[PDB]
Structure formats: C-alpha cells, structure tokens
Amino acid sequence: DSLAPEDGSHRPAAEPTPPGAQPTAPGSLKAPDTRNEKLNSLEDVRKGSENYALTTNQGVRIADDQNSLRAGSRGPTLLEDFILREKITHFDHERIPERIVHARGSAAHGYFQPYKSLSDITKADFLSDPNKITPVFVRFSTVQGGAGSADTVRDIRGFATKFYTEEGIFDLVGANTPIFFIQDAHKFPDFVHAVKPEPHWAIPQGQSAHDTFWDYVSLQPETLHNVMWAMSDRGIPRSYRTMEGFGIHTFRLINAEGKATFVRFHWKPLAGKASLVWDEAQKLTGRDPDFHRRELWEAIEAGDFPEYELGFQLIPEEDEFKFDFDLLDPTKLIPEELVPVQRVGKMVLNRNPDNFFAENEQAAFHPGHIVPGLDFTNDPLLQGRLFSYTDTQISRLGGPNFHEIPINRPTCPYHNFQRDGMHRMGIDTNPANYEPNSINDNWPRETPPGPKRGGFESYQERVEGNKVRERSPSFGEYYSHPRLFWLSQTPFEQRHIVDGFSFELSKVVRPYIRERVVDQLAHIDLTLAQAVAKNLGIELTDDQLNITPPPDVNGLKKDPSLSLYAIPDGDVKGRVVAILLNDEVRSADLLAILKALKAKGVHAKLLYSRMGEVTADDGTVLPIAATFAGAPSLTVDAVIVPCGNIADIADNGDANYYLMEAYKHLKPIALAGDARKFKATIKIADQGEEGIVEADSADGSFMDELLTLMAAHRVWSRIPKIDKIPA
Amino acid sequence: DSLAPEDGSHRPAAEPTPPGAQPTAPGSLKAPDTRNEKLNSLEDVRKGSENYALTTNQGVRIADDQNSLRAGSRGPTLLEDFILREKITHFDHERIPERIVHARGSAAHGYFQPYKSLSDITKADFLSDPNKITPVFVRFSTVQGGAGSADTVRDIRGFATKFYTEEGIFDLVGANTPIFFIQDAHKFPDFVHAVKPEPHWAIPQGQSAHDTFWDYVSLQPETLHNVMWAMSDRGIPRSYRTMEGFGIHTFRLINAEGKATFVRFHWKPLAGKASLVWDEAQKLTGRDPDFHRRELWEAIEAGDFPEYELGFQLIPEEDEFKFDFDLLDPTKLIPEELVPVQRVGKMVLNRNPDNFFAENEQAAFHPGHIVPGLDFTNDPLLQGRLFSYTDTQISRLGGPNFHEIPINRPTCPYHNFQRDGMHRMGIDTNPANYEPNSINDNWPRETPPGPKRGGFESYQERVEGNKVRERSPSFGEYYSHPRLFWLSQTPFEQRHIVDGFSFELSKVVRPYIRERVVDQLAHIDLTLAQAVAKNLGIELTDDQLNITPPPDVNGLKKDPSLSLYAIPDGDVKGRVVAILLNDEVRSADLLAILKALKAKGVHAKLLYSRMGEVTADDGTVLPIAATFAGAPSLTVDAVIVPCGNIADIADNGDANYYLMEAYKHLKPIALAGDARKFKATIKIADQGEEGIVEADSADGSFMDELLTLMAAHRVWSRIPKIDKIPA
Ligand code: HDD
Numbered sequence A, B: 001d002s003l004a005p006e007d008g009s010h011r012p013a014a015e016p017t018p019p020g021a022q023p024t025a026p027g028s029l030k031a032p033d034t035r036n037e038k039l040n041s042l043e044d045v046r047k048g049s050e051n052y053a054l055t056t057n058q059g060v061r062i063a064d065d066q067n068s069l070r071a072g073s074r075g076p077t078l079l080e081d082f083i084l085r086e087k088i089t090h091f092d093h094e095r096i097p098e099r100i101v102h103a104r105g106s107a108a109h110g111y112f113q114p115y116k117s118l119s120d121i122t123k124a125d126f127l128s129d130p131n132k133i134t135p136v137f138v139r140f141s142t143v144q145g146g147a148g149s150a151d152t153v154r155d156i157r158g159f160a161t162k163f164y165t166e167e168g169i170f171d172l173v174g175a176n177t178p179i180f181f182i183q184d185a186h187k188f189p190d191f192v193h194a195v196k197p198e199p200h201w202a203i204p205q206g207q208s209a210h211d212t213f214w215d216y217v218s219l220q221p222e223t224l225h226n227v228m229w230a231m232s233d234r235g236i237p238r239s240y241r242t243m244e245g246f247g248i249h250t251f252r253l254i255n256a257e258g259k260a261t262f263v264r265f266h267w268k269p270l271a272g273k274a275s276l277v278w279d280e281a282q283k284l285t286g287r288d289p290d291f292h293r294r295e296l297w298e299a300i301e302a303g304d305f306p307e308y309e310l311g312f313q314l315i316p317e318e319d320e321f322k323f324d325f326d327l328l329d330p331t332k333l334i335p336e337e338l339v340p341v342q343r344v345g346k347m348v349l350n351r352n353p354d355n356f357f358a359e360n361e362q363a364a365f366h367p368g369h370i371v372p373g374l375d376f377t378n379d380p381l382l383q384g385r386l387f388s389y390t391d392t393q394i395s396r397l398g399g400p401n402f403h404e405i406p407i408n409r410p411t412c413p414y415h416n417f418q419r420d421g422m423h424r425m426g427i428d429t430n431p432a433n434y435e436p437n438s439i440n441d442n443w444p445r446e447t448p449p450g451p452k453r454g455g456f457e458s459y460q461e462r463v464e465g466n467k468v469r470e471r472s473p474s475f476g477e478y479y480s481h482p483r484l485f486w487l488s489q490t491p492f493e494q495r496h497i498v499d500g501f502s503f504e505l506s507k508v509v510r511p512y513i514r515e516r517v518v519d520q521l522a523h524i525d526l527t528l529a530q531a532v533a534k535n536l537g538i539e540l541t542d543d544q545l546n547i548t549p550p551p552d553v554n555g556l557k558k559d560p561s562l563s564l565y566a567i568p569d570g571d572v573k574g575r576v577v578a579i580l581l582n583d584e585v586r587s588a589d590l591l592a593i594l595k596a597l598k599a600k601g602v603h604a605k606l607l608y609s610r611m612g613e614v615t616a617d618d619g620t621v622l623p624i625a626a627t628f629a630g631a632p633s634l635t636v637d638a639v640i641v642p643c644g645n646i647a648d649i650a651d652n653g654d655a656n657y658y659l660m661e662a663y664k665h666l667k668p669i670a671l672a673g674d675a676r677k678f679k680a681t682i683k684i685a686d687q688g689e690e691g692i693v694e695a696d697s698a699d700g701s702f703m704d705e706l707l708t709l710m711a712a713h714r715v716w717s718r719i720p721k722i723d724k725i726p727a
C-alpha cells in the first residue's frame, strides 16, 4: 500500500543540488556517474532494492511482514516463526564495538593525484606519476566522544586518509594540529582515560573540561603544546573542509637509490582555515549535534568537493639533530619558517558512501599500513601506535579478516599463506598454505626490493643503545612550543585561547588543579597566565611572576603559519547565508541577492516564522527551508534581511534574536531598506558599523560588501561590542 | 609520587553533600555505610587502589609506567615489552557493543519494600511481606541515541528495574509512557530503523525529527498514541526523578490458589511530575549533554534519593473484554478513571555505582525474567520481546554467561546443568551435567509449584485458533487513545504538543510526509490538526475538516492523570536555584535566601562574572560556584538576584541574558532591592507580574513567595509574554 507520492518528490534528483534543495541520499544514487577504481570495486557487494521481493536472509519471500505467527490472532507467538526470529536476531546483533578513540566520525570517498613525480625522494608508487590517480576514503572525527556524541565540541579532530595504491594500502592517519599531547605510546591509555568521561559516573561526554583531564595536564607538562592548540579556535573548526591536516610524526621517504629523507605530512584545506567561536560551537552541539557530518555530506552533494593539498616538510638525514627540539618528538612541531611545506598533490572528496555503517563504521585505518618508498622512525608515540591499530580490530571488526570488509579491501592484488579466521570470505585454492613449498612451486612468491613494484624492505637504520625504558633527554622541554604557538596568534585568537582555558578550568571542581595549570601557564607566558588567573580569581605569586620565559624556537619569536587568521586565506564557495523572509518580499532585492550569491558559489537558506510558502511582491512562490528557531544563525555564516513587509517580522522575537546571535558570533549581517530598523535590536551604530551592511536596497554594491565580509569569515573588530548584548 | 595536595582537598567527604560542593565519587567511597544485600554481595569483586603497587594484570610490579622499552633512549620500541603490550591490548579492547536501543542510560542502586503482603493476589516472594526488603538496580535511559548521545533530547525514556529477589531476578523493563508505538514485535526493527539515524549518513542523533520517522508514523497509525506522548512535554522530562514509569504490557499475577489477575505496572514519582520546555531541553543538550545523568548522581550524593511508588492496575480475568480497547494491545492505555492504580510499595534509589562500565554498561535487563507469582499474557509486542532480551546479550556481553557478570548475578541460589560457554566463571563440581542422573542422586532437583519457594509453572491459559500471521481486529483502532490524551492535557500542554509536532515536521524535508501526518492528526482532533497545519503553512481540505472524531474511551472525555500538570504534585526538594552575585552583595539577603532554600532542601549555586570569591558588604567571603556562562539558566529551576552593587553586573550581557533565558523558559525569578533594575531587561511593568518575586529586600515573605512558584514548577501564565522577547 503505502506508496510514493504521485509526483515523485520522494526521490532526490540525481544531480548536484544546494544544501536543503533535495533530501540527501546514498552516494551511488545521488551521483551514479561519479566513479573511481575503489568505488567500482565495491559493486560486488552493493545491493539495490527497487522492484525486488522482500525476503528472509535465506532468500525466502515473505508474505506478511506486519505480524508474528501465533495460535489464533490474539494468541501466543509460536517458536516456529523463523521469519520473525531471523528478523529480530539480526536486529539484536546490529551493534559492533565503537572505536576506543575517534568513535564519532564522518567519511567520504575521493581521489588523489600528485602534482609531479616525486621519484627523486621516494619510490612510493602513488607519488610517482602526475597522471596516476589513487582512490581515497577519508574519515574525519573528534577524539573523546562516543559515535553518538556531538560534532562541534572542543576537541582535537582526526583526519585519516586511506590511499588504495597499486602497491598496497597506505593509511595516512593524522589530526588537525601538528603535534599530539604525549610523547610515548605507553602513556596513551592514561591520557585517553584522563580526557574521557570519568569512570565512576561516565561524565562528561566530548569535553575535556573536567577534573581528570586538567589533573593529568597539570602533572604532565609535555601535553601543554597540544593543549594550547585545543584551547585555541583550532579546537572548534567551522567544517572539516576548513581545518589543516597533519601526520604529526616524522616518517621517512625512501627513494630507489636507498636514500632516506625525513618527512612530516601536511594537508592544506583549499577552502581555507576557519573556526567557530566557543559560544556558537557549544550551542551548536545542542541545536545540531550532526553539523559537521551534515555539512560535509551536503558540500559533496552540492559539488563543493572538499579539496586538500598534500604537502611535505622535508629534512635531510644529516639535519636530524640541527634544531633545538628533537625531530622524533611528537609534542614538537616543525615551524614552516624553518622548513617550508613543499606542495605534493591534491585530494578531492567527491562522493558520499551508500551505507554509513558498512563503509564508515567498519573502515579500519592504521598508521602501520605503509608501502615501499615510505618508512617509519623511532618516534616513540608512532612506535607504539604500530602495535595498536591491528590489535584493536580483532574485537572491533570481529577478527583478522577485517581486510575483507569491502571498504577495507585493497584494489591491488593480495595473496599470502594466511588462512581461516572468523568470517573468512576468500576461498583459497592454493595447494600450499605455507612457504617454502614445492607443491605450488613456491607461489605466491617473495619479491626482492627494487625501484618499482618491489617487496618492502626496512631502511637499515643504525640502532645503538641499551634496552632501557627511558625518555630521551632531548624530549624534556615543554614550554618553548606552547609559547611559539601563543605568540603567533592574533590578539583575538589569544583572547579566545584565554577564554577556552578559563572556561575549562572553571569546570574543574578541585581548585588546586586549576592553580597547578595556571602555574604551568606561567612557564609559557605571563600575559597568558595572568589573563587566565584573573578569570579564575587567582593571584599569581611573586615567584610565578618571575619565571623566565622559555627560549625562542631556533630564533623564532613567531610563525604566522600557526595562526588561523593572521594571513588571509578566505574562500566563500560552499558557505551559507540565512535569508530572513517576510510575507511580501521585495523580489528585486531577492534577485540581486541570489545572483550575487550564486556567482560566488555561496548557498542560501530561506527562513520564515512558519514552514510552507511565502509569496513575494511579484507572485514568486518561495518555499521555506526552516523556521527562525528551526535553523538558528549558528548553522549559517552570515544573515541577509531583504526589504518587503518588515512589520510582519519586526516584532518577531525569534527574528530579532536571530540577528543578536549572529551578531554576538561575529557574523556579517546585511540589512536592506526597512530591514535596517533591526539595527536597534543589536543596539549598535547609527551612522553604520564595520560588519553590518546597509543600503536602501540589495544591489551589486550591497552584495559585494557582504561577500567581502564573508571572505574574511568573521567580524573580529566587533569583539569589544559583544559582551554587553544580552544574547 | 605523592601528588595529592596536603590538606586533602582532592578527596570528597564521605557524607551527603549538595550538588557541586565536593568532587563526585564512586558510590562505595562516597557512601560506605549505605548497604543492601546486592551491594554487599558485590564486595568479592570490588577492587581498591590506595597503598597498592601498580602491576600488570598478571600481578607483576611495574617500575616505570611512563616509558616503552626501546634500544637506546631514542631507539625503536622492542617487541619484548610485554608491559606496554598488555596495557595497550586492554585499552585496545575496552569497548563492547552498546545496546541496540536505550544505549544512553543512567543507573543506580536501591531498595524496594511492599506496603502490605500481596499474598491474596500473587505468590511472588518479594511482595509477600512488608518487612521483606528487595535490593534493586535501576537504569533510566533514552531510546534512540547512542551511549554518548545527549540526555535532554525529545524521546521516550526507558525505566528498567532489576529486583534481586529471594526466588530469582525479576526485571521490570518499562518506560515513562503507558503505551508503546507498535502493536507486534515483528515490526520493532522497522520502527527502530525509522526513528534511528538514517542509514546513508547516520543523521540525526537523538531525534525523531527526520523524514523516515514521520514516514513510518504516517503509514502506521497505531504509533499515533505514543507519538502524542513524545510530542507533549512528557518527551523532555526535567529529570528521571520527575517522570512516571509504566510496564506498558498487561501481565498476570498468579496467587497460591492458582488464580490469575491481569496487571499493568506503574511507578509514581514521589518528587512529582515535571518536564522542561522544548527550547530549554534542546539548548541543554548543548550546554550539558549529561544533565540527567549528573542530576541523578548528585541527588543521590546529596541524599535526595529518587523515590518511586510501585502501583498496580488490577483487572479480573472476567473483565478481559469489558473495555472499548483490547487489554493485550500495547498501543492502548488503561485510564485510571476506569481502573485505579493500587499502591503496592516504595522504591528508594540511594547509592550510585562504583564503576559505570562494570555495573551500568554491562547490566542486562529482560522482561522475560519473571518469578513464580507472575506470568505473561499474549500481548503480541511483549511476546516477541521475550525472544530478544536473552538473544542480544550473546553479542553485547560476549556470551551466555552474562548472568555471571557481577551486577547481573542473582543474590539467591542458582544451580542447573548448564556448562561452559565463553568467560565461564562458575566451576561446577557436580559429577553430573545432565538430568535425570543417578550419579549425583538427581541434584540439583526440580521443585513442584507451591505457595512459596516452588518451581515455575505457567498459568494454564486456554489457547484456541489457527496458526496465523494476523493482527487481531480488536487492535485496529488508532485515534481514540491519542484523542483521550489530547483532551486530558491543559491548554499550555496542548500548545506544547502542537509546538512539538510543528517543530518536528518542519525538519521533515519531503513536504508530502508533513501533509500525511497532518491528515492523521485530523482523525484525532480538528483543533490540534488545524494548529499544526497553520504552523506548517498547510491548509486542511473541507473533507479533513469534517472527519468525525474518534469515540470517547469507555465514556471518558478526559482523564486528568494523563496530564503532567493538571493536578498539582509539586515537590521542591532537590530543585536548584541560581544566585546572581555582585561584588558587594547585601549579606542579610544572602543569609535569608540561602537558609530558606536549605530549609526546603532546595539547592543553590552562587554565580558571578568570574571564578574565585566575592566579599559581601559585611566582609563575608562568598565562594563562586560558576560563571553566568558556565552554568546557564537551563540547569536551574529558578533565579534570584540579591541586592548589592547591582551596577557591577547591571551592564553585563551574560547576567542580563541569564534572566532573559530563564524568563522565556517560564522559571520563577526573584529580584531584591536594586536587582529590580533588571525588570527592564525582561520587560516587567512597575506594578510587577505573577511569576516575578520583588521586594525591597530578601526578608519577610520574599522566599515563601518564590518557593510557592517553585512548587508550581513553571509560570504557565507567562507563555503569551514570551512570544515576542528576543532570547
Ligand atoms: C597506542 C595507541 C595509539 C596512540 C598512541 C594513538 N592512537 Fe590513534 N587510535 C588508536 C590507538 C592509538 C586505536 C586504538 O588503534 C584506534 C582506535 C580504534 C582504531 O581503529 O584505531 C585509533 C584511531 C585513530 C584515528 C581514527 C581512525 C578512523 O577514523 O577510523 C585517528 C585519525 C587517530 N587514531 C589519529 C591519532 C593521532 C594523530 C595520534 C598521535 C599522533 C594517535 N592517533 C595516537
């Protein structure tokens, strides 16, 4: 019975559409023409549904899927109802363990291509030819929260890319900050337990603002550098598209001649760097906990493909010990002023998955999954990571055949003498299951190392030392990087860092813990220490006021690449404007607005006080995306209020608060005609004010002003005016 | 090392302490003298920590837990480091599958005691004597969200009680609404999948406001009744302590004579019925996603034990067919005006767990777990539930030995011939592992049914009919209960229902689904349908305008027990008041304020613009609990602003907004002396207005008036005033 509407409006058009225009859908139905080798290789397991009979898992057609089998229609359910038990059994066993860390993540498919051959420095096949494309699957995530936690929390973000290369899978498993909190993997469980929900009551979710995290940080100064990044606006990115990606550790590139080059991996967001502000981010976890997941999926459906530039920081083997920090210390970043990021290639994410569980939830990424031409280093965090990502999927993905889960399968050949394990898919026909063997003539065979298509051979690094459980003495420096980071931020970023620490520490119940953290801040910078201390009602002591600042990092007093906003990098394509409608919209304003927005690739969401439709002054029927309360200003980048019958929304509480919220969160607001009367609500400026666009109508000049504001992301000059507005 | 602070402030006092005064802690440490048989039985597995050496899982002392073993202090990590590998292995496999539904839940220990023997109607041992104390373990939950999802979402709430009886575990697995959405267990997966995050992208979390839920609802009218409950304020409870509890299904009570009585289980909140308002609940999912979990824990730590009264709806076997609706239909409630709830006993929750994962996450509840004196019915939803709850823990808790997990273990004896299975703890010495046997003289033995301590025998219900997959025709009525619920709500409750539907339907992207639900509502009540339709810009057709309303339920045109607020049941103990401080507070007001609150067990939180202290007019040093932004008005029940230097916070946006938010969410507000200046922030006239307490000081009747408002929960007369106001 229950069928599609007559008009076929149940199904989304299979073409790129702006966010909100059509219901979202599985990637292969939304963009059937978007292909790559990995996507095509998944065709063996994709299952359709249209025009097929409903069946059991054993292929038996079901006649009645509305009822259990029972003795009489008001009788007991019978044990022989195998249709019911199969259906319930499958339901009862739907869940699989979520990831210990990074449980909350959003993923997409894409492709990578190098700009030029990198054969002089590496024999890795995927970086050898500019016209050789490598399919990717990328998963972005948060760290602390469960798979059901919110997206816009303050946390580090994970940035994992699976490269399906012709010589094996390469997983580049990184983050959105260039360092990690700890130095040795042996302490991972301590750090993670400290930041995770506390053990007695399992609170708080997706928040570091609790006693145990700050206790750990206070006793483990090595965490301060990544804590600085977390407390900055880097901890609350606007989108996965507008954050940097870093592999954190120093790895090696190995060329065909055997030369090893130290490398640190970077991802540069081609959409620019952009973060939310704390109040916005926190409120957004409540208004839309799926904001980053939704934004990524819709960008891809709209053709606004998340694009990243892969970059390498290359350090010659002879320069290993030439910085004032150890290259193998993952709490230490390599300043771009010292070692520039060389551009390597572009990564484009152009298709969403079909089924989240099957492809995203089951995907297994592991930093040990390298290929010939790449190698590890002795970074002690990286070292311990190699043990963990293979181990963990034995329970998470049920066994050692996790490489056979469709999303994890290599697109290149794979043959070995490994057999069985739970849910073995591969049916091996090889007479032998061991080597050496004569019965299959020793196949599959080992392959000597070589310039191309060779077997993996580890770089023969000289190892010289006693068996010790000891931290390198060169890792024993914890304040210089934190301070380099602090001094590289703009004044408004520095305040946001202050506010982040002050907010977090205010949630720490034990006051001595707050004081210990403030003491640690005094070893980084007294201006910073004092600003936090004042917000906590703490007085720095005389000894604290006399702590000598840490040395500069190899002479650097700052490095602007560490700031999100010091150097403009603002792209408006893919951003969204909230348009506040009224019941007699001036169609001339609306036309100029959409044309201008369309030219720059900026989307629009038409909002009103109710759903359904509104008719403009020229009879144009405008479908309403959401109500003012339904899609808060949190969800958009700027707000436009066109002229029309302004008296319709002039006394609307939600319409007024929409502007106050956007204003508080430093977003550009544009008011046309009688819409300028909303200026009173945001008690500010008579003549005008930088950040607020105004004119008698919405024209070319009005829209160019707004788009220029959006290019700079937020109106930082308005900071001084926001802490009086009651919003 | 010796890192605790000399002064012992790291450790919370082991005595009842109000919320926020001390760091929360594991139950056995916070309240060591609070015991019961189950808590004492868990002593064999409880593990301490203080004064013990740090070891591996095999008992080997660890010398250095900061480092991995490597060849050289900057060398590679060695495979022989078994201390590293064991610690990472345990960490790597910490997670277990979350529950398929109700993954998000908060639990506590407690006890139950009947008021009088129920031997005349049931031979269940736990109800046979008023002096018989039964230890309980209760878990409250949401339904849709994952374990890391938020607490104050709009959803049904789970309410599961594990009764550790002398004759077996009795699990009463209910919810906070008297009905469920579907009629037959075979459609459970259908309904759940429809409400859960959509499969392509896994959005949205913790919400039924999406197309697939409303698609299903519109095609399955049986769901309308529970949908009505969810859309009302019942879907967003103030706390687990202030919601009702129901078993939903009609079960049987069996006495010693063999007589069967139909019974529906009820839980009455002794703190009363109380819910949030939509905007507060949604915002509160952002400001504190653990609000219910925290509130439950802290109430128990303050000694404000959640107390519930078990009640029975009793229906004689001869009255099975005397109602308009089928007694076995779970989408139908039994109106208390027809069948009164008879008070049976009291449940007190007085101790939190020690470890959330071990006790809360691994607890397994199942409604098939009944004891002699209770029995099932043919309710088709219940029938299928009996299959599911044993089945699901084979994956969730790793096997069939899940009753051996400490929290799940019976306190009474258990002996049988079941053996082996993963994680087998019990070491059986019985020579026989089968019955009948002679080698152990047939022990353990079967026990015949009898008045007390006898074997389980099912009630010999007559079964007659053909083997059919068929819904009983008596279940085919879908609108009369929904309508009864609608008509029993107050006008502001009805507005809130209209608002829930309107908001949820606005998040449904396909307009035709919205229209179809509107068509269903028009079968329930025209006023309701029209109001929702208006908010969605949908016009009812003339046909929809003349749909004749469903008949009354057995002559009833309303039943006031179905309303949260129609019949007052306001309890103020355990509620919390925000106190907006200034830098020269009038200490006399503060003393009057704080003592009046303490007298009624109402908690307070002293807030300010920063942390630290503030000095009152007489030099009294006031400890600040949180900042205005740090503990938003969403978390409190009322706000008081004492006299003092009001100009200190008068132009503080946050303080002003605090009052705007609380005013909007209908909470009592009290302003003393110059704190009346804030009236212009909330637009209060000079003469005052109901819901706002105001006077020259906090003396006389100021606190009694404020406490009367708190007793009535929220100021429902202010609804019309909140319409405008930009907050
Ligand atoms: C020693 C253990 C260890 C340590 C020291 C790290 N983690 Fe890790 N992390 C794991 C143990 C692990 C894990 C336990 O193996 C996980 C979770 C489950 C999974 O599959 O892998 C994982 C997941 C995981 C993911 C999610 C993969 C996904 O999206 O599926 C990311 C992006 C990171 N990690 C990145 C980091 C960063 C950049 C780290 C340091 C630089 C780091 N990990 C340290």
Ligand code: HDD
Residues within 6 Å of the ligand: A088, A092, B099, B100, B101, B102, B105, B139, B140, B141, B157, B158, B159, B160, B173, B174, B175, B180, B184, B185, B188, B247, B248, B249, B330, B363, B364, B365, B381, B384, B385, B386, B388, B389, B390, B392, B393
């Ligand atoms: C046939 C399937 C079935 C049906 C029709 C129901 N559920 Fe259920 N229930 C599940 C299958 C299940 C489950 C999959 O077996 C769960 C998941 C986790 C578990 O242990 O039990 C569960 C758990 C579960 C819990 C959480 C126990 C805890 O806190 O651990 C609550 C309170 C209930 N549900 C309540 C109910 C009620 C009031 C429902 C309707 C009357 C209902 N469920 C219908």
